[PDB]
Nucleic acid binder design. Structure first.
Ligand SMILES: Cc1cc2nc3c(=O)[nH]c(=O)nc-3n(C[C@H](O)[C@H](O)[C@H](O)COP(=O)(O)OP(=O)(O)OC[C@H]3O[C@@H](n4cnc5c(N)ncnc54)[C@H](O)[C@@H]3O)c2cc1C
Ligand SMILES: [Zn+2]
Ligand SMILES: [Zn+2]
Ligand SMILES: [Zn+2]
Lengths: 99, 113, 737, 98, 12, 79, 26, 99, 80, 104, 97
DNA sequence: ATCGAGAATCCCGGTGCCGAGGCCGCTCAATTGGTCGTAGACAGCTCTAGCACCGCTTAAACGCACGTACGCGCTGTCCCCCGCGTTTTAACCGCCAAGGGGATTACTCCCTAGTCTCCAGGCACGTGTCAGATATATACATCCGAT
DNA sequence: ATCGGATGTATATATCTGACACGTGCCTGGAGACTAGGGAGTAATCCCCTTGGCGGTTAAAACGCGGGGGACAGCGCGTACGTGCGTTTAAGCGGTGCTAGAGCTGTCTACGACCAATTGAGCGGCCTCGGCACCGGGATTCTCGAT
């Protein structure tokens, strides 16, 4: 008798897990290739220490995570429970991100 | 003709456990003022000892209260973010391997009976 | 620990703690230090620490109080202050007549006025027979107060709501605390311009320091009691204010309350004698006298039964002093004389206006009588013969110029002495001509006529043509704080107040005094028919004109100094006409205004009915009143009443040219000028004269012959109020002896 | 393998000592020790810089303990300021008594 | 300042 | 393939669910790649200048922690 | 005196106004 | 004959053209000055102020409040509302990190 | 009395008009006085701290431009 | 001769201000020339945009309003000064498009 | 009798660059003091960044190259390019004399 | 309305292993002890600029009516995104290779603090205009009914 | 959907007045010409630590496929606040007075750099085992589909 819990049990339970855990999410080699690719524009043929790639990973996840905190408060303040891109644009504008 | 005279250090001249000489050298060698006074890093080492004792204290209380015997940086995350004033001193500071203190907005919690 | 007190000279041979706040209280035993509040009140070092030390249970209560005492006061919150204000037990005096013992209330009981009002010993055996705490007697030793650390601060003073602008502890009240006639404003407010009959809540007046020198160092206790007394008087001015009524309203902790209660009686009697309270038309009879039997042995003859004579007589009588009033005429009142024969209205032949009701004795007396006054509106159109209301711009233009003329006069006089005085009228004229010369500006005939109206209004005010009045001194009295607030029509008339003052006094009518002899042991007074009177002291209140005429023979004669002052003032004069009509013919044009002005056709005629007064504020009856001033007073002296009436009606038919005016059905024309015992309306300063003249005339002779009347009041000349106050003044002087 | 390294500094034994003072039988991990190290450096340049410009405003050229008291009363929020000043005066006077 | 004084309390 | 998509769709889901986000719309992912791209462009544009000033060809950890500090986003745990 | 005037009071020639500045004032 | 009036919003939008257009200082100087003194009495007593410092705190007041209505207005517009409400003030204050 | 209240309801209206706010709800003014009160409490606290350190009884304008600089709200036009 | 500088901006005063702020222990030769050149550039175009945006108000004297919108119109000068209030500046006329009253 | 101290500004220099750009067009005093505190602000940002940048490379000397790097960190993009290009113009225009 | 699969989550138990903690040499930065110009507490004046006070006009603030439009709750309707099996597929991991570049230590040397005097650049200080606010009268631009 | 009061707003023109651009004087900080120790460019090397490749497994990513609930447009109904007019009312002004304290300048002095010998103290190398993972098994709890 297959029966999925619902739209929200995987969500809220998985929010309890991925708030509760500590480790770094987005994978090492695609992120590393990303930083090298953006790095090629300002200067050719760079080199990275590995821990610096972990550092850009950590600040990048913390900045995105805080952005989803705030855009979540944005869309909840519209009596919605779903992030939509104009909410992202709002928090980037409200915070001051929007140049 | 002697330079002994009870060869003592300092931190014990003030009753602390912080390096007055190392902090003192770091005040003279960052170009903050051309002259640096007599007892300034005594005062400043006192302030930093209080702050260190506060954060490590709350990570100790949270360290028992999440069932370990060793402070990990996660306990520094929710140790710092639970006091109001320590959070206000460190509100622009990310600490790595910290994660997020568990916050759930009220509309996300289920609308059960 | 010790059994001795910190304070040097304290006679407490056995200190005990009144606080018992600490579980460690020393009681009657040993303590490291006994803290002294008074010779009979101490608290031990343990209870001190109980509040003062942060680690003690009473610290909260002391810090909270210390905060209120900060957002509310200007004195430092010391533990001793906290104690005297918060912990000291109350004391209350047994009200049983044959007991009257003072009792300490238990520390939890909060004394109220109701408790104090009815308290008897034991109120929670013969409780009244238990000996009085020996500490009570001590309080009445002069050195007792000297060894009080802090001055008393009253709680819930009746004066409090009137003083919300002051720091409570600067006016004798406690920082930890908290429908009157709008005319009662006894206390100066911070940053106020002067106004008449106001006292500073935080400073003793000169006469007060004189009577109570012991308070010059610290006036706190006095001010609290004086302020309370005034507040109580003004709260209910229809009853004599007695110590019994005050005492329940004196709420303060400690034995000091006993000292406060003991002082209230002294201050009450001083306030009464001076005429600040228990005054006005308040009447008091045998066994109700307002001053102790100590003032009663003495006697007085008062000459004249106008506002001044009757004020002094009322005061002295209420004091318990033997008084006889001798009046020349067949009626009392003097320049107060009301015609009650007009339909539904009372019309004064003399005074009827109250100039500045705030703190005015007249306003107080109306309160006491339940009388309402009518406040004048501002509007007073300047109506021309015949019909035209003066253009608002012309009106404003000439008002400005008129007052500008007064400014330069006030500037010219600054460096002139009496020996260089010139008549106000002449000065204004010159300045006016010299201005038209200077600036080519030229005014129309009407503009000139409007200026004449204003001049006429000055003449009405002074009771004289302006060429008689001093440029230097015409407005001398404004050097002193004047009566602020509404000017009103006393619609029932001043006679109601007069009647009330005179009621039950010993007054002899038709008894004109001719001789006063004060050369012997007591004053011999003889009337024109030879009737003899005698008393220890005599007060003369006859009008200035009668003093000038020398109708009373003084022996010894008045001083040359007095005579010069008497003659330096002018016996000012105006006359009134009142007219009754069949209907209110002026309503269309006048539109409810209290009065309307009359633009003079010429300078010579300017004082002939310059202002007309609508004598019914209810706008129902039809009575007009007008005045004759300046030059026009002379022009009317050989005219009979009918002729004056004819000229007034001719004037009205001009002022209301474009309509019809009914005939008057009843009228009067006054002849004060030729009333033998009066011969005037009100005083003014003649050219060469000084305001000091009023003081000189006011000066008693050898504390035996006293003077009152409007012409003796330098602050408040001319008025019923001023005359009334001069009588109160003299009653105080006479009663002091 | 066999060659001189490069002398280095830290705060780590001091943070370990205050850990022995507060909860004496309790461990700490290594990256948390580097967190506290960078924390002590971060606060140290905060009040050092506040002492720099706070001493620059008054036309002085000397950093004394009054300046550090003011600058701690600027960065430390409130209740965190007060006990820092009480420990600071206790360490100045407790130093000075010798 | 004579101006402000209460009339009945400045009779010295 | 995803030249820069790397931050797979479930990876952005995992970061959002660390942030406490229940339901994610459709175009969120491309904009998320854009915002992350702008942030990294500024951070390593500033970091590569620190690596160029020492005339060194290898970016270190102190480089990016210093350049993060300057942008008001200070990050402990590396120096 | 000027104080006798009710209707159409004169205003010119007045001395400067004095203002009580006590300390007891909050 | 008696209407004339305007819509609720013409005086508003024309008023936005005026008060965005002008520049001067528009909280009254003595109530603001008494406000700064009364807030100033708590930390220390018996103070003295230069006048231009009160001007300077007036500038910080207008800058911080006005910018807070910028972000509050974008908050309420992002709810499809043209009228700001106190929860929007609370939102922009949390987004700027003012708790 | 009640200095805070001295910030008038039309003044908060006027600052909203400069901000580009059309319509203002009911309890906006209470919270507006509260927020202004908090901001002036922090700025005045730091300015007083800047003024007690020079041991001077008078607060100047350079004091509070410094205090606004340190809170990341720098304001030109008064020096420094 | 005394003529030695003949450039722009005070090299010596700026050089003093680099030496007397305790930044390094010692300050090289070419540096205040460099920093003075940069500040003359920034000063130059900010006063230029206040120049054209001053002429648009048809005035001759630049008031701080012209520095307000002169900064806030360009992107880069705004991003350099995005945390800086200007006294007597005001705002640019920003109006959100939903507030524009539409109709027929 | 006795006069009073002083205190420098940039106002004559700001006035001179204004005379370079739009020469027949003046300046008001509030805007002059705003420009004054503006150039003090940028001066302390760039000198401060020179301090934080010299304080990393174990160097205790602020030459022009550190000001080049610190300008290439503060100023965004285009005006960084022309700013640094004018800086090379003034170093090279200086030393070639 | 209230009760069972059952699946995720939490509670002990041996294992291991390795990173946390500790111990032994050991360079060098703290330390101690004198000097020394000088920055700065400290006293005193001064005068000036902040605070206090009082009267007058009035723009601005306050307060009452009123109406409509803005907020907001219900209703339906669609679809986009959540959830879960199935494939694949590329990330993770171990190890092996090579060298380019970071860190080190030394070498040499130009260069930027430091001194003293010399002078004009800017900066304090009168000064008198020409740019702008302020009326002041005057013809457009758009709003708002009412048609 | 057009037309007209009307009405707020843009457009010359004077007008005072004063804030700014400017001329006089001065004094001190910019500069100019030296020296000197040291910070740093510059070479060369050590080695290590970044890069690169390659194979083996596979957790994660991709993708297809239900399906339902969440966004959103309509819509009706209340209320609250914008608009405008009479009342007040205290803010601005504008002068007047008083002196507390910023600021100046001088006095005298206790205190931080300069060296310079002395040493243990924190730090790196190098062990060593116990706490956290970590399967591994097992009872609890919560959810979701039933009554
Ligand atoms: C027409 C008129 C209008 C006035 N308008 C006003 C006004 O509007 N408001 C206002 O306040 N005041 C007004 N006054 C003035 C006011 O009435 C007087 O100032 C006041 O009455 C004077 O008081 P008095 O007691 O001093 O003297 P009086 O009233 O004059 O009385 C003196 C008494 O002394 C008596 N007397 C005289 N000689 C002898 C003697 N030899 N023996 C015995 N008795 C003697 C007289 O008979 C008289 O009874 C007006 C007066 C008049 C005449
Ligand atoms: Zn006791
Ligand atoms: Zn005693
Ligand atoms: Zn009894």
């Amino acid at each position: 008798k297959p029966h999925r819990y619902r739209p929200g049990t995987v969500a809220l339970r998985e929010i309890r897990r991925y708030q509760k855990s500590t480790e770094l999410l987005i994978r090492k080699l695609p992120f590393q290739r990303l930083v090298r690719e953006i790095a090629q524009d300002f200067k050719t043929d760079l080199r990275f220490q590995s821990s610096a790639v972990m550092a850009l990973q950590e600040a990048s996840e913390a900045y995105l995570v805080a952005l989803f905190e705030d855009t979540n408060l944005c869309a909840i303040h519209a009596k919605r429970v779903t992030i939509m891109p104009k909410d992202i644009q709002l928090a980037r504008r409200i915070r001051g991100e929007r140049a | 003709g002697k330079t002994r005279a009870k060869a003592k250090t300092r931190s014990s001249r003030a009753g602390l456990q912080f390096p007055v000489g190392r902090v003192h050298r770091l005040l003279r060698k960052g170009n903050y003022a051309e002259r640096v006074g007599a007892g300034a890093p005594v005062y400043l080492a006192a302030v930093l000892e209080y702050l260190t004792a506060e954060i490590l204290e709350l990570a100790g209380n949270a360290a028992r209260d999440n069932k370990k015997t060793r402070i990990i940086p996660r306990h520094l995350q929710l140790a710092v973010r639970n006091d109001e004033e320590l959070n206000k001193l460190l509100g622009r500071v990310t600490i790595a391997q910290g994660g997020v203190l568990p916050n759930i907005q009220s509309v996300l919690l289920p609308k059960k009976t | 620990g010790s059994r001795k007190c910190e304070k040097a000279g304290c006679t407490a041979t056995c200190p005990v703690c009144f606080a018992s706040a600490s579980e460690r209280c020393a009681k009657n035993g040993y303590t490291s230090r006994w803290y002294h509040l008074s010779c009979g009140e101490h608290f031990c070092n343990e209870c001190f620490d109980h509040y003062y030390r942060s680690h003690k249970d009473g610290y909260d209560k002391y810090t909270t109080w210390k905060k209120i005492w900060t957002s509310n006061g200007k004195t430092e919150p010391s533990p001793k202050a906290f104690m005297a204000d918060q912990q000291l037990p109350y004391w209350v005096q047994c009200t049983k007549p044959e007991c009257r013992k003072w009792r300490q209330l238990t520390k939890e009981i909060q004394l109220t006025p109701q408790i104090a009002k009815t308290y008897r010993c034991g109120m929670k055996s013969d409780h009244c027979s238990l000996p009085e705490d020996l500490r009570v007697l001590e309080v009445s030793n002069h050195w007792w107060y000297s060894m009080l650390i802090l001055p008393p601060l009253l709680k819930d003073s009746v004066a409090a709501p009137l003083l919300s602008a002051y720091y409570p502890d600067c006016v004798g009240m406690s920082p930890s605390c908290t429908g009157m006639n709008r005319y009662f404003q006894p206390f100066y407010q911070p940053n106020e311009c002067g106004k008449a009959l106001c006292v500073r809540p935080d400073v003793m007046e000169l006469d007060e320091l004189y009577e109570f020198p012991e308070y010059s160092r610290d006036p706190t206790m006095y001010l609290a009691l004086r302020n309370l007394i005034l507040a109580l008087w003004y709260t209910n001015c229809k009853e004599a204010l007695t110590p019994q009524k005050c005492i329940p309203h004196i709420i303060v902790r400690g034995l000091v309350r006993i000292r406060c209660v003991q002082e209230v009686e002294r201050i009450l009697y001083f306030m009464t004698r001076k005429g600040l309270i228990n005054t006005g038309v308040l009447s008091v009879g045998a066994d109700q006298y307002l001053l102790p039997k100590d003032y009663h042995n003495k006697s007085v003859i008062i000459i004249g039964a106008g506002p001044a004579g009757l004020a002094a007589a009322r005061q002295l009588h209420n004091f318990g002093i033997k008084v006889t009033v001798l009046e020349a005429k067949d009626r009392i009142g003097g320049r107060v004389w009301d015609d009650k024969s007009f339909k539904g209205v009372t019309v004064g032949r003399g005074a009827q206006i109250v100039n500045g009701c705030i703190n005015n004795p007249v306003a107080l007396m109306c309160e006491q009588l339940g009388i309402s006054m009518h406040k004048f509106g501002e509007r007073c159109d300047l109506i021309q013969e015949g019909g035209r209301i003066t253009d608002p711009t012309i009106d404003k233009r000439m008002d400005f110029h008129f007052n500008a003329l007064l400014d330069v006069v006030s500037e010219w006089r600054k460096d002139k002495t009496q020996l260089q005085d010139v008549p106000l009228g002449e000065k204004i004229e010159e300045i006016y001509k010299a201005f038209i010369k200077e600036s080519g500006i030229q005014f129309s005939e009407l503009e000139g006529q409007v200026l004449q109206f204003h001049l006429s209004n000055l003449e009405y005010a002074c009771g004289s043509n302006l060429h008689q009045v001093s440029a230097r001194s015409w407005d001398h009295n404004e050097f002193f704080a004047q009566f602020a607030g509404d000017h009103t029509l006393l619609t029932p008339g001043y006679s109601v107040i007069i009647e009330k003052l005179a009621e039950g006094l010993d007054i002899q009518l038709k008894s004109p005094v001719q001789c006063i002899d004060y050369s012997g042991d007591e004053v011999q007074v003889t009337t024109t028919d030879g009737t003899g009177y005698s008393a220890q002291k005599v007060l003369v209140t006859v009008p200035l004109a009668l003093l000038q005429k020398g109708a009373i023979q003084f022996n010894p004669p008045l001083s040359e100094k007095k005579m010069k002052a008497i003659n330096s003032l002018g016996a000012g004069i105006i006359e009134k006409i009142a007219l009754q009509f069949p209907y209110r013919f002026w309503d269309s044009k006048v539109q409810g205004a209290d009065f309307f002005g009359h633009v003079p056709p010429s300078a010579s005629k300017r004082g002939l009915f310059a202002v007309f007064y609508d004598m019914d504020p209810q706008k129902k009856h039809s009575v007009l009143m007008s005045v004759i001033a300046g030059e026009a007073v002379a022009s009317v002296r050989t005219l009979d009443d009918k002729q004056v009436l004819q000229q007034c009606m001719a004037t009205l038919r001009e002022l209301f040219k474009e309509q019809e005016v009914p005939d008057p059905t009843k009228y009067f024309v006054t002849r004060w000028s030729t009333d033998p015992w009066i011969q005037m309306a009100y005083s003014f300063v003649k050219t060469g004269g000084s305001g000091e003249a009023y003081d000189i005339i006011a000066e008693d002779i050898q504390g035996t012959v006293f003077f009152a009347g409007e012409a003796t009041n330098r602050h408040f000349p001319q008025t019923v109020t001023g005359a009334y106050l001069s009588g109160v003044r003299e009653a105080s002087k006479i009663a002091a002896f | 393998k066999k060659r001189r390294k490069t002398r280095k500094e830290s705060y780590a034994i001091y943070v370990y000592k205050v850990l022995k003072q507060v909860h004496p039988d309790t461990g700490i991990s290594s990256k948390a020790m580097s967190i506290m190290n960078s924390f002590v450096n971060d606060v140290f340049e905060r009040i050092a810089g506040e002492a720099s410009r706070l001493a620059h405003y008054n036309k002085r050229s000397t950093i004394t303990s009054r300046e550090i008291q003011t600058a701690v009363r600027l960065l430390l929020p409130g209740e965190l300021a007060k006990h820092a000043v009480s420990e600071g005066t206790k360490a100045v006077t407790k130093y000075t008594s010798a | 300042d004579p101006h402000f004084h209460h009339f009945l309390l400045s009779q010295t | 393939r995803d030249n820069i998509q790397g931050i797979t769709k479930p990876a952005i889901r995992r970061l959002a669910r660390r942030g406490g986000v229940k339901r994610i719309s459709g175009l969120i992912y491309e904009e998320t790649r854009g915002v992350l791209k702008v942030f990294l462009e500024n951070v390593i544009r500033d970091a590569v200048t620190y690596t160029e000033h020492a005339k060194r060809k290898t970016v270190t950890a102190m480089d990016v922690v210093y350049a993060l500090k300057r942008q008001g986003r200070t990050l402990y745990g590396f120096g | 005196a000027r104080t006798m005037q009710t209707a159409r009071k004169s205003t010119g020639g007045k001395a400067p106004r004095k203002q009580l500045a006590t300390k007891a004032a909050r």
